[PDB]
C-alpha cells in the first residue's frame, strides 16, 4: 500500500475528482455519489469512492500545495487512477473576476518548486490533458455557469503574493492564483494519465477573508457538477 | 511605418497566418487567396493580403526563431492584426509521430530567450488563445485530417538538441520541436490578441534532411486549410 | 479569524508543536497534554491546546510541504505563536542513520519553492532560533535519548528524489530529507518568532514503506518529549 | 545539402561576410564583387559568391536573431566557411554614439537564449577570433573611418529593451545592442573557425525610426569595405 | 607540500584559528601562544604553530574572500587540520550592532561564488560544526563577554553591497556581512572537519572607515580568547 | 587612505602591474624597478612604486580570487590608478599549452561570484581595455616571446575544477584557468580605467604540483617584461 494514501488498487476508480480540502471531499461524496465509502483517512487525506450516474468515481483530498498534491497524485496513479480532475478554489488576480465564477485552467504558470524539482529547473508549460480540458469547457458552457477559460498560476507562498504582483501577472494572462495545478498537469504527462483542473474564485489577492460562504458554496457546487459530468465524457 | 515590416494601415487584415518560411507565405497567398497583394518585402519578411471566402486574410513571414517572430508580431499587432495563427513545421521528438502529420499546439515549452527577456526570467506557460486553439482543433476534425493535440517546444539552438534530449522531453509531453510558438503565445496575452499555432511534422530530430516533398506538402496543404477555416471561425 | 486555521488568538498558546500529520497531532494532545481541546479542524489541519506541566502548549497540524506549513505558520504567528517547534519524520540520506533515531535540525537546505518565493530567489541559510536549537539539544541530553545534530534538506518533490541523489547530498552534510523545516526557519526570522525542528527517522530513503510501528513510535514518543521539555525552556 | 541554406561545398568561399538583411546581402554582392552568383534563396536567406580583388568572397544572409544566425553559421561551416565576419547594424546604448559610426566588436554580451542553450546555461565571454578582430580594427584605422572598439550586447527581445536599461548597460561598457554577434563568436570557437563583427549604428534605443538613409547608407558602405579588406588578410 | 600553504604535515596542529589578516595572525601567535614558530609565509599566507595551555594550536592566514579561504582550508585539511575556527571582522547589517561586538555565526548566507561552484549552483545552508558552534557560544558566556548568536552573510563584492541591501538582509536575520564563513562551513562538511566562526564588528555597511581601533582591538582580543578556549573543547 | 591598501594618492602611479602573489610583487620591484619603494604591506597586500625607464610604475599585490582582487582594484582606482595590468599564472585547460607559455587574455569567462554580484547576476563578456590588449599583444611579438591570445576563465574554487570539466571548457575556446581577470576587466569598464591581463602557464588542470621553478620563472620574467613595455605604451 502507498505510504500516504493507504488504500488498495481496488479502492480507487479510474475517474477521480481532486479537491484540496478534505471537508469538500466528504461533501462531494455524500452530495453526489451513490454508495460512497471512505477508503482512506490517513494523514487526513480523506478519499472516497462511489458511483455517479452508474459510473465509478473517487474523490481524493490532495492537501494544500504542489508537494502535497504531487504525493497524492503519484500514489493515485499507482492505485489505478487514469482521469484526475482538480476541483479547487483560487484568488482572483484582477477585479475582472468575481467570487463564485469558474475557471477552466487552460494552463498553469509554474511558480512552485515541485514542478521545478521534477523538471530539474528546466522551462515548461504545464497544461491539462487536451481531451479532459475540452470536456470541462464543454460542460461549463452547456450548464451555463459563469466561467473563464485560461491561465492560472500555481504558487508556493500564499502569503507572499502582493496585489501589485497579482496585477502584473494578470497583464500576462494569469486570471488567478492557486496551489496545485502545475504539478498535476506535469505528472499527467510524465505518468501518462489524463488530468484537468477547474476552479471557483473564492476571493481577490490581498483580501483578508474569502467571499460569503453562500457565494463560495454555490460556486463549488457548480464546479463539481461540471467536473463530474466531464470525467464521464472521457 | 514599423521598422521591419514596412507596411501601412489597411495593408494587414485582422486575421493573419504566420509561416516562418517566406516561400510558404507566397505559396499560401497564391494558392488560397483571391487577388493577393504583397504589402511588404523588406528584410525578406514577405507579407501578402487577399481574400479567402470573401474574408480578408493576411499571410506574413516571421523568419526563423522567436527574436525574429517577436519583431514581426509586435509590428503586425501595431498594424491591426488581431487573430494570428502560426502555420509552420516542427521536428518530431518521438517515434510515434510521422512526417506530414498535423499538430495543434496546446502550449509551448519556452526554451527560448525571447520569452525569457519579456518575462524577466520568470516561469510561464505559453498557451494560445483558447477560442483559436479550439477552432483549429474543431476544423481539423471537420475536415477529417489526422492530427495530434498537445505540447511542442520552442527552442533557440536548432543544432544543439540531440535525439537523446528530444526523447527525454517527449517523456514530459513534448510532441515536437519548433522555433516560434512560445513568443507568439506570450505576446498574444501581453498585447491582448488571439493567437494559435498548427504544425506539420517535417522530420524527426536527428535527421539530416526533411521529408519527401509530397508527404510534407500534403501536410502543409492540410495545415494551411485548417488554419484558414479556423481564423474565419473567430 | 485566519483563512485556513479558523481560530482566535486566545485559542492558541505561545508555545506550539508542529507535526505534519493530523493523526500525530491528535496522538500528541491525548498522550502528552492535560485537558487538551481541539480548536480547529478546518481543512483537516487539526490543532489542539492543552497543558504540559502547567504550561499551555498547542499542537497544530501543518500538512505536508512548505507551502502548506508556511500557510499554517503565518496564521499561527498572527494568532500569537511565539515559539514553534516542528516535530516530524524524515527519510535518512545515508545508510548509517537508522529509523527511530532523533535529529535536532541545526539547519535546513532550502530545496523548496516556498522559501524561494519569499526570498525572491536569493540564497539563504535556513536556521532555527539559536536558543530553541540549544534547548532541543540540551533536553535530548538531559533525557538521555540517542540523537544526531545537523542539517536536513527540505524538498518539494517527494517522489523525485532518488536514493543516489540523497546520498550525494549526504556528502555535503545532509542527514535526512523532510518537507517543512526550511520555511519554518525562514519565517521565524522574517516574523520575529522562535522556531526549531526535531525529527524521527522513519526510513532510509528509497524504501517502499516506513519502518515497523513500535520502532518508529518509540522514536516519535521520544522526539515529542524532547520538544515539550524544550519549549518550556524558552 | 544544408537544410536551411540550400547549397553545396563549392558554392561557398572560405571568406564570408554576414549581413542580417537579405537586401543588404544583394547590394554588397553587386556593389563590391565581380561575377556574383546567387547560390541560395531558400527561406529568403539570399547567399552570393563572387570575387573581391581576385579573391572569392561569399555574402550570406543570416536573418534576424541569434537563432536564425546560428543556423546559418552552423551550415556555412559545414559548407566550408573558414572566416565569417558579420556586417550589421546596431542600436546605440549611449548618447555619444552617432548614427553611421562604426563599431568593431571586441566582444558580445550574451543576453540571447541561443548561446545560453549551447552553453547549457553556463557563463561565457563571446569574443571574435583574435586575428580577425585586429584586422578589422587595423583596416578601420587605415581607412580613417570614424569608429569605436568595444562591447556590444546581443539581445533577443528587440521591443523589450528600454532606454533606461540601455543606459544602465552602457555604464558597464556596452556600446550598442544588436542581435547576432554572441552566437557567431561562440560558434567560432566551438567549430574552430575565425569570426568577427563590425557594426554601423543605425539609431539609438528608444527611437521609433532609424537614422536618415543617407547617413546610414554611408556607414554600411564603410563597414563593408573594412570587412572585405579584413577577410582577405586572414 | 601544498601549492600555496607550503608546510609539511607536522607543522600544523589539529586545532587552528583562521584570521583573514596575516597581521592578526602574527599578533595572535605572539600574544597568546608559547613558543610560536612560523611554518609558512609563502604568498603572505603566514601560518604559525605554538602552545595554548599546553595544547598545540596553529594560526593560519586565509587572505580575503572565499576563493582564498577555500584554498587555505583545503590545504590545511590535507595537512591534518581537524578543528578550524575563523576569527575575523564583519560589517554590521543594522544599527543594532555596536562596533567591537562579538558574533557567533550560527550559519552563513552563501552570497559567494566559491560555494556555488562547489555545489554546482544547488541550494545550501552553510553551518558550523555543531560542537564547535556550541563551544564558542559556551566560552563567550563563561568569559563573560557580551555577544550575539545568529546569521552572517558571506559576500564576494565588498564594494557592491549598499546600506539598503544591508537593511533588507537584516530583515531576514542577517546580523552582518563578512567574506569567508560560507565556504569554510561547506568545506567543513565536505572534508569532514569541525569548523566555526566568530566575528568582531568593525563597521557598518556604508561606513568609509572602520570603528575606533581601541574598541576594535578589544573586540578582536575577546574574540581570539573565545576561539582558543573553544577549540580546546573539541 | 583606503581600508585594505593603506596608501596615499601620491604613493601609486598611473601605471600598475597586478601580480597575485606578494613574493612576485617584490621580485618584480627589485628586478625591474629603479629606486623601488614599498608603500603598503597591510594585510600582506605588498605594494611598490618605482621607475621603469624613467616612468613611474607601481606593483600591487591583489591576493588570490576576484573578491580579493576587486577590493585592491577598487582601492587602486580611488587612488588614481589609470592603467592596470595583471601579471599572474594560470592552469592550462588543454594539452597544447606548455608550462611557461604566455597567454594574452582577450577575455575572461566569468565563473566567479564577484563579477556576478556587481552585475546582479546578468550575463556579461569581461574584456580588457582595447588599447591595453593591443599593446600587450604587440609587445609580446616585439620581444619575440612565444605566446597565445585568447580566452581564460576566472574561477572561485581552485580545487573544484576537474580535468574533465577543463577539457570541456577548452572546446569552447578556454585556454586556461585563473582567478582574477574577469573582475579586473569588469571594474575596468565600470570605473573607466584601462585594464589588461597576461598570464604564464604554471601547470595543467589536475597536476599535484606546479611546473619546474625555472621553467615557470623564465615565463614570469618574459611576462613582466611584456607588461612593463605595454603599460608605457598606453
Ligand atoms: Cl473505474
Ligand atoms: Cl480585416
Ligand atoms: Cl501561553
Ligand atoms: Cl575560397
Ligand atoms: Cl595537534
Ligand atoms: Cl604616474
| C-beta atoms of D46 and B44 within 8 A | yes
Which chains would you list as touching F if contact means 3+ CB atom pairs under 8 Å? D, E
> What does A96-155 look like in DSSP terms, one character per residue?
TS-TT-EEEEEEEEEESHHHHHHHTT--------HHHHHHHHHHHHHHT--EEEEEEEEE
CA distance B158 to chain A (A): 17
The rounded distance, in Å, linking the Cα atoms of C135 and F152 is 51
> What does B28-78 look like in DSSP terms, one character per residue?
HHHHH-EEEEEEE-GGG--EEEEEETTEEEEEE---SSHHHHHHHHHHHHH
* F-contacting residues in D 190-209 (Cβ below 8 Å): 190
The strand pair at A174-178 and A147-155 is best described as parallel
The residue count for chain A: 234
The rounded distance, in Å, linking the Cα atoms of A212 and C202 is 42
The rounded distance, in Å, linking the Cα atoms of E144 and B197 is 72
The rounded distance, in Å, linking the Cα atoms of D214 and D225 is 17
The rounded distance, in Å, linking the Cα atoms of D78 and D71 is 11
* D-contacting residues in F 152-191 (Cβ below 8 Å): 171-173, 182, 186, 189-190
Chain C residues touching residue A24 (CB < 8 angstroms): none
CB A76 within 8 A of CB A187: no
Paired strand residues for B133: none
Tell which residue, D181, D105, D185, has the closest CA to residue D147.
Answer: D105
| C-beta atoms of E111 and F118 within 8 A | no
Residue C184, all three cell numbers: 519554518
The rounded distance, in Å, linking the Cα atoms of B186 and D157 is 12
The rounded distance, in Å, linking the Cα atoms of F132 and E35 is 50
Chain B residues touching residue A111 (CB < 8 angstroms): 122-123
For chains C and A, having 3+ Cβ pairs within 8 Å is answered yes
Q: CB D141: neighbour CB atoms within 10 A?
A: 13
Q: Cell match 521529408: residue?
A: B211
Burial annotation A51-71 (CB, 10 A radius, 16+ → b, else e): ebeeeebbbbbbbbbbbbbbb
Tell which residue, C66, C74, C30, C69, has the closest CA to residue C48.
Answer: C30
Name the experiment that determined this structure: X-ray
Tell which residue, D168, B189, C125, D226, has the closest CA to residue E189.
Answer: C125
The rounded distance, in Å, linking the Cα atoms of C160 and C149 is 26
The rounded distance, in Å, linking the Cα atoms of F28 and F224 is 7
> What does C32-55 look like in DSSP terms, one character per residue?
H-EEEEEEE-GGG--EEEEEETTE
- The domains located in chain D, with CATH, are 1-234 (3.40.50.1580)
Phi-psi region for residue C113, left (φ > 0), alpha (ψ -120 to 50) or beta? alpha
**Closest CB to C66 among A20, A67, A71:** A67
CB F227 within 8 A of CB F221: no
- DSSP H helical ranges for E79-231: 113-119, 130-142, 163-170, 181-190, 213-231
Paired strand residues for F201: F90
**Closest CB to C110 among E108, E119, E125:** E125
Burial annotation D19-49 (CB, 10 A radius, 16+ → b, else e): bbbbebbbbbbeebbeebebbbbbbbbbbbb
**Closest CB to E124 among C109, C127, C130:** C109
Tell which residue, B48, B232, B63, has the closest CA to residue B73.
Answer: B63
Q: Which DSSP symbol is given to B188?
A: H
> What does B66-130 look like in DSSP terms, one character per residue?
HHHHHHHHHHHHHHT--EEEEEEEEEESSSS--TT-EEEEEEEEEESHHHHHHHTT--------H
Helix (H) or strand (E) holding D73: helix D66-79
Tell which residue, E56, E4, E15, has the closest CA to residue E34.
Answer: E56
The rounded distance, in Å, linking the Cα atoms of B132 and B152 is 17
Q: How far is the CA of E56 from the centre of ligand 5 (A)?
A: 5
Tell which residue, C153, C155, C184, has the closest CA to residue C69.
Answer: C184
The rounded distance, in Å, linking the Cα atoms of F73 and F66 is 10
> What does C55-113 look like in DSSP terms, one character per residue?
EEEEEE---SSHHHHHHHHHHHHHHT--EEEEEEEEEESSTTSPTT-EEEEEEEEEESH
CB F86 within 8 A of CB F70: no
The rounded distance, in Å, linking the Cα atoms of E229 and E83 is 12
* D-contacting residues in B 92-131 (Cβ below 8 Å): 111-114, 116-118
Tell which residue, C55, C95, C196, C72, has the closest CA to residue C139.
Answer: C196
The rounded distance, in Å, linking the Cα atoms of F73 and F84 is 8
The rounded distance, in Å, linking the Cα atoms of B145 and B226 is 9
Judged by a CB distance cut-off of 8 A, whether residue F63 touches chain E is yes
CB D176 within 8 A of CB D91: yes
The strand pair at F47-52 and E194-204 is best described as unpaired
Phi-psi region for residue B84, left (φ > 0), alpha (ψ -120 to 50) or beta? beta
Q: Measure CA E192 to chain center.
A: 17
Burial annotation F105-123 (CB, 10 A radius, 16+ → b, else e): bbbbbbbbbbbbbbbeeeb
CB C224 within 8 A of CB C143: no
The strand pair at C174-178 and C83-92 is best described as antiparallel
SS3 C171: coil
Phi and psi (nearest 5°) for A176?
A: -170, 165
The strand pair at D147-154 and D102-110 is best described as parallel
Distances (CA, A) of A227 to A58, A99, A220, B157, E58: 12, 19, 11, 41, 71
Residues with CB under 5 A from ligand 1 (ion): A 13-14, 56
Tell which residue, B115, B106, B75, has the closest CA to residue B196.
Answer: B106
- Spatial neighbors of F102 by CB under 8 A, at least 6 apart, are F140, F145, F146, F147, F148, F198, F199, F200, F201, F219, F222, F223, F226
The rounded distance, in Å, linking the Cα atoms of B209 and A14 is 43
> What does A30-92 look like in DSSP terms, one character per residue?
HHH-EEEEEEE-GGG--EEEEEETTEEEEEE---SSHHHHHHHHHHHHHTT--EEEEEEEEEE
Q: What is the CA angle D180-D171-D165, rounded to 5?
A: 65
Distances (CA, A) of C84 to C13, C99, C195, E93: 10, 24, 5, 26
Q: Measure CA C169 to chain center.
A: 20
Phi and psi (nearest 5°) for A164?
A: -70, -40
The rounded distance, in Å, linking the Cα atoms of B197 and F177 is 46
| C-beta atoms of C150 and E137 within 8 A | no
First-to-last CA distance in chain F?
27
The rounded distance, in Å, linking the Cα atoms of B174 and B150 is 7
Resolution of the coordinates, Å: 2.1
**Closest CB to D71 among B66, B117, B158:** B158
Amino acid at each position: 500500500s502507498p505510504i500516504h494514501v493507504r488504500a488498495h488498487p481496488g479502492d480507487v476508480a479510474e475517474r477521480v475528482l481532486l479537491p484540496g480540502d478534505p471537508g469538500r471531499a466528504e461533501w462531494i461524496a455524500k452530495t453526489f455519489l451513490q454508495n460512497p465509502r471512505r477508503y482512506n483517512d490517513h494523514r487526513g487525506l480523506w478519499g472516497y469512492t462511489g458511483l455517479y450516474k452508474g459510473v465509478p468515481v473517487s474523490v481524493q483530498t490532495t492537501g494544500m500545495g504542489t508537494p502535497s498534491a504531487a504525493i497524492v497524485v503519484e500514489e493515485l496513479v499507482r492505485l489505478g487512477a487514469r482521469v484526475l480532475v482538480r476541483v479547487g478554489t483560487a484568488g482572483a488576480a484582477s477585479s475582472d473576476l468575481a467570487p463564485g465564477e469558474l475557471i477552466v485552467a487552460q494552463g498553469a504558470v509554474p511558480l512552485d518548486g515541485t514542478t521545478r524539482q521534477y523538471l530539474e529547473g528546466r522551462p515548461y508549460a504545464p497544461v491539462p490533458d487536451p481531451e479532459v480540458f475540452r470536456a470541462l469547457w464543454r460542460r461549463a458552457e452547456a450548464l451555463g455557469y459563469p466561467h473563464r477559460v485560461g491561465l492560472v498560476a500555481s504558487e508556493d507562498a500564499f502569503y507572499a503574493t502582493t496585489p501589485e504582483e497579482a496585477r502584473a501577472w494578470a497583464r500576462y494572462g494569469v486570471l488567478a492564483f492557486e496551489m496545485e495545478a502545475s504539478a498535476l498537469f506535469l505528472l499527467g504527462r510524465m505518468r501518462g494519465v489524463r488530468t484537468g483542473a477547474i476552479l471557483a474564485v473564492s476571493n481577490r489577492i490581498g483580501d483578508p477573508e474569502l467571499a460569503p460562504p453562500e457565494v463560495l458554496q454555490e460556486g463549488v457546487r457548480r464546479m463539481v457538477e461540471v467536473a463530474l459530468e466531464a470525467v464521464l465524457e472521457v
